[PDB]
Amino acid sequence: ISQERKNEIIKEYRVHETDTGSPEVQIAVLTAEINAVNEHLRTHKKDHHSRRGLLKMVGRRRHLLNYLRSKDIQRYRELIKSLGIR
RNA sequence: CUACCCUUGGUCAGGUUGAAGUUCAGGUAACACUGAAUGGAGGACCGAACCGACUUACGUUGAAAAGUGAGCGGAUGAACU
RNA sequence: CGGGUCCUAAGCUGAGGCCGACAGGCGUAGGCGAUGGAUAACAGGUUGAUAUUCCUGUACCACCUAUAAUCGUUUUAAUCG
RNA sequence: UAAGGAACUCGGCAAAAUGACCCCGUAACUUCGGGAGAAGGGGUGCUCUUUAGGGUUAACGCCCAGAAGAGCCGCAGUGAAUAGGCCCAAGCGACUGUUUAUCAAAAACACAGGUCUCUGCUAAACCGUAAGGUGAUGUAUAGGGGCUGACGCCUGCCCGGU
RNA sequence: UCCUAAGGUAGCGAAAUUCCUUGUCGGGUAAGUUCCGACCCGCACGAAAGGCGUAACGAUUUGGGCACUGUCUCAACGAGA
RNA sequence: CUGCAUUAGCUAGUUGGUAAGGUAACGGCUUACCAAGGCAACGAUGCAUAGCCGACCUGAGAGGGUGAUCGGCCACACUGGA
RNA sequence: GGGCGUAAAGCGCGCGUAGGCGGUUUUUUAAGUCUGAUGUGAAAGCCCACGGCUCAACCGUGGAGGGUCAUUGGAAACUGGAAAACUUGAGUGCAGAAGAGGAAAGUGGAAUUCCAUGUGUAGCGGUGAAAUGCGCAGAGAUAUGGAGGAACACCAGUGGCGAAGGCGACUUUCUGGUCUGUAACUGACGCUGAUGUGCGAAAGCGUGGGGAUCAAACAGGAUUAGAUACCCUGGUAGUCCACGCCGUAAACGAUGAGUGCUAAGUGUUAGGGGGCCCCUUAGUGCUGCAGCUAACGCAUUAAGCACUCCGCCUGGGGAGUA
RNA sequence: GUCGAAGGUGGGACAAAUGAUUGGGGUGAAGUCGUAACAAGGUAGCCGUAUCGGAAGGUGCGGCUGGAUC
RNA sequence: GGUAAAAAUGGCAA
Numbered sequence: 003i004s005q006e007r008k009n010e011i012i013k014e015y016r017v018h019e020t021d022t023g024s025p026e027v028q029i030a031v032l033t034a035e036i037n038a039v040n041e042h043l044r045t046h047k048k049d050h051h052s053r054r055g056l057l058k059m060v061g062r063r064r065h066l067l068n069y070l071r072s073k074d075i076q077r078y079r080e081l082i083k084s085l086g087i088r
Numbered sequence: 089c090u091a092c093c094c095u096u097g098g099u100c101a102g103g104u105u106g107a108a109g110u111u112c113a114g115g116u117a118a119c120a121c122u123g124a125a126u127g128g129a130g131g132a133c134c135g136a137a138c139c140g141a142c143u144u145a146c147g148u149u150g151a152a153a154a155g156u157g158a159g160c161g162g163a164u165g166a167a168c169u
Numbered sequence: 170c171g172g173g174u175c176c177u178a179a180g181c182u183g184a185g186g187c188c189g190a191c192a193g194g195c196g197u198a199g200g201c202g203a204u205g206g207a208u209a210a211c212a213g214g215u216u217g218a219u220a221u222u223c224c225u226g227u228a229c230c231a232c233c234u235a236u237a238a239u240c241g242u243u244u245u246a247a248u249c250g
Numbered sequence: 251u252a253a254g255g256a257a258c259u260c261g262g263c264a265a266a267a268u269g270a271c272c273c274c275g276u277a278a279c280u281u282c283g284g285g286a287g288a289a290g291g292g293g294u295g296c297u298c299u300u301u302a303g304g305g306u307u308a309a310c311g312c313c314c315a316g317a318a319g320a321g322c323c324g325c326a327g328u329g330a331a332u333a334g335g336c337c338c339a340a341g342c343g344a345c346u347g348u349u350u351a352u353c354a355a356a357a358a359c360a361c362a363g364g365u366c367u368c369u370g371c372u373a374a375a376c377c378g379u380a381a382g383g384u385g386a387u388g389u390a391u392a393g394g395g396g397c398u399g400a401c402g403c404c405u406g407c408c409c410g411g412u
Numbered sequence: 413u414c415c416u417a418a419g420g421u422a423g424c425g426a427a428a429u430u431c432c433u434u435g436u437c438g439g440g441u442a443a444g445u446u447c448c449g450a451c452c453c454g455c456a457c458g459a460a461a462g463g464c465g466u467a468a469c470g471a472u473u474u475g476g477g478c479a480c481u482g483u484c485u486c487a488a489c490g491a492g493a
Numbered sequence: 494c495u496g497c498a499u500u501a502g503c504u505a506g507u508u509g510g511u512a513a514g515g516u517a518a519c520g521g522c523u524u525a526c527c528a529a530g531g532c533a534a535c536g537a538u539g540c541a542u543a544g545c546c547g548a549c550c551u552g553a554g555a556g557g558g559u560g561a562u563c564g565g566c567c568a569c570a571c572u573g574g575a
Numbered sequence: 576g577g578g579c580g581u582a583a584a585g586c587g588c589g590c591g592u593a594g595g596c597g598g599u600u601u602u603u604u605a606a607g608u609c610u611g612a613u614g615u616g617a618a619a620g621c622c623c624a625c626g627g628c629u630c631a632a633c634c635g636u637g638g639a640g641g642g643u644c645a646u647u648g649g650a651a652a653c654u655g656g657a658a659a660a661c662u663u664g665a666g667u668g669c670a671g672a673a674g675a676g677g678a679a680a681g682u683g684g685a686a687u688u689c690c691a692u693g694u695g696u697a698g699c700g701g702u703g704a705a706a707u708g709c710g711c712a713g714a715g716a717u718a719u720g721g722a723g724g725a726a727c728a729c730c731a732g733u734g735g736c737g738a739a740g741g742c743g744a745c746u747u748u749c750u751g752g753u754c755u756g757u758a759a760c761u762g763a764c765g766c767u768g769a770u771g772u773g774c775g776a777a778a779g780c781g782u783g784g785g786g787a788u789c790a791a792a793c794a795g796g797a798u799u800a801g802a803u804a805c806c807c808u809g810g811u812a813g814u815c816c817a818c819g820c821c822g823u824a825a826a827c828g829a830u831g832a833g834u835g836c837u838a839a840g841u842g843u844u845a846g847g848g849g850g851c852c853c854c855u856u857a858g859u860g861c862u863g864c865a866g867c868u869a870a871c872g873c874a875u876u877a878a879g880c881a882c883u884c885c886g887c888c889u890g891g892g893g894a895g896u897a
Numbered sequence: 898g899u900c901g902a903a904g905g906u907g908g909g910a911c912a913a914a915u916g917a918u919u920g921g922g923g924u925g926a927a928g929u930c931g932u933a934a935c936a937a938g939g940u941a942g943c944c945g946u947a948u949c950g951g952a953a954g955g956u957g958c959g960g961c962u963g964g965a966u967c
Numbered sequence: 968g969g970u971a972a973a974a975a976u977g978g979c980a981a
């Protein structure tokens with residue numbers, strides 16, 4: 003995804019100004035990137051190498067979503083409805 | 089008459105099975121996929137009309153120059169008319 | 170009411186035309202040709218023998234004649250097409 | 251129709267047996283569809299009592315349709331009539347279908363599929379002396395002809411002869 | 413060693429093909445020229461005049477069970493033409 | 494406190510509830526009714542094998558093997574039912 | 576109280592689920608842990624002591640011991656639980672870097688084969704030597720043109736990239752990962768990974784397309800005792816493309832992954848920093864201590880020293896068979 | 898009358914024995930055929946795969962060194 | 968660059 007679009011996503015989900023590392027920001031950007039590669043894979047179904055990157059991104063999102071639910075369930079519930087992930 | 093064909097018409101009680109697809113639920117990164125429900129496929133199933141003619145008995149100067157009786161096959165189809 | 174004085178399918182025929190010892194074959198325009206399209210009447214009564222056909226009652230369709238509310242009256246704006 | 255029960259016979263030919271509906275249950279094998287109604291069993295009348303319902307109605311009523319229990323009668327309750335016999339193997343043909351009108355219905359024909367070959371379009375092929383047609387108002391994923399015949403696994407060697 | 417264009421492969425096999433032949437052995441039967449399995453000395457199988465399998469299907473051909481019975485032992489009686 | 498996954502599904506009185514009956518007694522123990530539960534890779538279900546233990550044999554120990562005599566508990570009494 | 580480079584043994588390689596394991600500080604709790612008390616763990620036996628049998632065996636008596644036991648009282652370091660912090664791990668941002676990483680279109684040039692003509696002539700081709708073959712119906716050779724498929728010389732390097740298998744003309748589009756610096760941010764969010772789930776050379780299989788080259792099978796020639804080979808001339812599948820299937824290789828570093836620690840010297844790839852030199856990060860080679868090893872060897876790219884987790888081994892054959 | 902041992906009937910499951918015949922394995926004469934591997938084993942060998950051949954094996958494709966004189 | 972081609976076999980003991 004473009005740095006412009008990424009920056010827009012950070013601003014939408016940043017917990018505080020200057021926040022770039024919160025699970026919310028990281029999950030949101032990951033969600034965008036997963037969708038973009040899923041789009042690539044629809045046209046290019048035999049780009050196995052790119053799909054592997056997508057699999058790693060899905061796992062990293064899962065692990066952060068696991069951590070957030072563990073720490074703050076409200077923050078989790080708000081993030082999943084906002085990003086439409088479940 | 090009969091064979092095939094052309095054009096235009098008609099007919100096929102009732103019962104059964106339950107394809108694809110779809111929807112919902114679950115499931116997935118997205119798909120596969122799973123379960124219900126829905127759906128109504130087929131030279132599909134059983135069985136009358138109808139069409140046929142496997143067996144057998146009768147009939148054999150016949151009721152009949154090819155039939156009758158009892159069973160028998162198909163019966164939405166390459167159907168029958 | 171069914172058919173004709175309506176329509177066309179397959180098919181048949183076919184002015185000229187094309188082809189062919191002859192006879193004749195083929196074929197265009199155009200015709201003909203229902204098994205289909207279009208198309209205005211029903212109930213009751215009645216004979217030994219006919220009936221949506223006769224009769225009784227109540228209808229419908231096309232056309233004609235007359236009188237016509239109204240509308241028009243020649244680039245026409247009433248009307249046919 | 252005693253007793254027997256295929257001893258009959260070329261051969262169970264014919265006959266007998268099975269048969270309805272409901273419930274339980276159901277194998278090898280398989281192309282996963284099937285096989286299957288597999289098979290093998292159980293129930294079925296009438297009366298009374300209690301009692302889930304559904305359709306149509308304001309309701310009543312009417313129509314449909316169960317369940318449980320307790321009784322009654324006969325040799326027997328789909329009390330008549332009508333309604334699969336079944337199973338295990340082997341050959342052949344995949345299959346539905348077609349055929350010797352009137353001695354053969356089949357393992358024969360056809361078939362979807364395979365393959366070879368011809369054919370560039372006024373196509374090849376076919377009918378006609380021709381004209382004119384079919385092919386096709388189609389155009390090589392098409393059309394004619396030969397052979398093979400679902401599907402699965404396969405399909406070896408020989409071009410000397412014709 | 414001789415010959416050929418090349419010498420039949422896989423699979424299958426007393427077979428819708430096997431003369432000899434009721435081959436031989438095993439199974440099934442009290443007893444089986446049929447049948448099934450196996451064997452291979454294939455008279456004279458063999459790969460699209462296809463080879464070998466094959467679920468489903470068959471008024472197909474074939475062998476064996478269960479049930480059933482006047483088919484039979486072996487006939488008898490009754491109804492009707 | 495036992496082996497086997499070349500045993501992965503198992504169960505319909507089954508899991509729970511309600512009521513009644515029944516038992517010294519609690520309880521699906523049983524029976525109607527209602528619901529769809531219960532169990533299982535932390536090995537259910539199946540199959541095989543086996544009485545269990547105090548002990549006993551061995552081993553430096555940790556372990557391994559075994560379950561005579563004696564004592565405890567359980568089960569059985571020709572087989573099966575009452 | 577053993578191992579898995581070469582002896583038997585690292586899954587071909589990822590993505591991940593359960594499970595196992597997990598950085599630093601504080602506070603608290605007390606499940607594990609530690610320390611007592613109480614009850615109980617029959618008797619017999621074992622063990623120890625003593626006593627009785629002439630001794631011993633044996634008999635008797637008293638201790639001692641035997642729980643993964645229960646109940647209850649303390650301790651709190653560690654493990655666990657709870658609460659609150661931290662930034663070193665792990666990520667994110669920001670600023671840079673290189674790359675045959677992947678997918679899909681498009682564009683080139685060399686060469687091979689075939690076909691068409693011109694010139695031209697008696698061979699060409701091939702081998703150890705031959706022959707089959709091709710050619711005289713004009714071959715081969717040479718010149719020019721056309722058709723088609725496949726692969727990309729030079730660059731090119733123990734070079735680069737990728738989890739592995741792999742990836743080499745160029746262009747564009749889409750897309751994955753990695754490294755350096757910085758220290759915005761988050762704040763242990765981590766590691767491994769049974770069962771799962773994907774990817775996976777080549778050959779092979781299915782459907783459709785394509786067919787230059789090479790080439791199982793197959794056919795000639797030759798060699799040979801024979802030659803079902805090696806060599807020669809041909810040649811089909813296949814080799815190529817698409818989409819499915821297969822799921823295996825000495826899929827190898829015969830070396831599982833993660834983390835930290837432990838002499839040096841030298842080359843190279845992509846960076847960073849400071850004065851050609853020095854320092855530094857991540858790769859990639861060679862050489863070589865300590866240590867390790869049966870030896871060979873390995874040696875900061877461990878096969879050294881450690882901790883976590885997974886897979887695997889237990890004589891050979893039968894057999895990777897039934 | 899309910900329940901009910903034993904018994905009967907039926908379709909399945911599992912186990913063991915046996916069966917014409919057939920398959921590979923093992924062992925055992927100094928049997929027959931060839932010579933595939935070990936040396937550059939006389940075509941380096943081996944791994945996966947495909948196909949072919951009396952037999953070991955051959956050949957194609959990819960891979961490995963656990964090969965490669967000068 | 969090469970390269971000459973062909974080039975089989977030989978009981979178990981001690």
Ligand SMILES: [Mg+2]
Pocket residue numbers: 132
């Ligand atoms: Mg039918």
Ligand SMILES: [Mg+2]
Pocket residue numbers: none
């Ligand atoms: Mg009849």
Ligand SMILES: [Mg+2]
Pocket residue numbers: none
């Ligand atoms: Mg039928």
Ligand SMILES: [Mg+2]
Pocket residue numbers: 135163
């Ligand atoms: Mg029928």
Ligand SMILES: [Mg+2]
Pocket residue numbers: 183196
């Ligand atoms: Mg005419």
Ligand SMILES: [Mg+2]
Pocket residue numbers: none
């Ligand atoms: Mg005229």
Ligand SMILES: [Mg+2]
Pocket residue numbers: 203
């Ligand atoms: Mg008419």
Ligand SMILES: [Mg+2]
Pocket residue numbers: none
């Ligand atoms: Mg009259």
Ligand SMILES: [Mg+2]
Pocket residue numbers: 251
């Ligand atoms: Mg009798």
Ligand SMILES: [Mg+2]
Pocket residue numbers: none
């Ligand atoms: Mg009798």
Ligand SMILES: [Mg+2]
Pocket residue numbers: none
């Ligand atoms: Mg007889």
Ligand SMILES: [Mg+2]
Pocket residue numbers: none
């Ligand atoms: Mg007789």
Ligand SMILES: [Mg+2]
Pocket residue numbers: none
């Ligand atoms: Mg009969």
Ligand SMILES: [Mg+2]
Pocket residue numbers: 343
């Ligand atoms: Mg047939």
Ligand SMILES: [Mg+2]
Pocket residue numbers: none
């Ligand atoms: Mg038929």
Ligand SMILES: [Mg+2]
Pocket residue numbers: 350
């Ligand atoms: Mg006839």
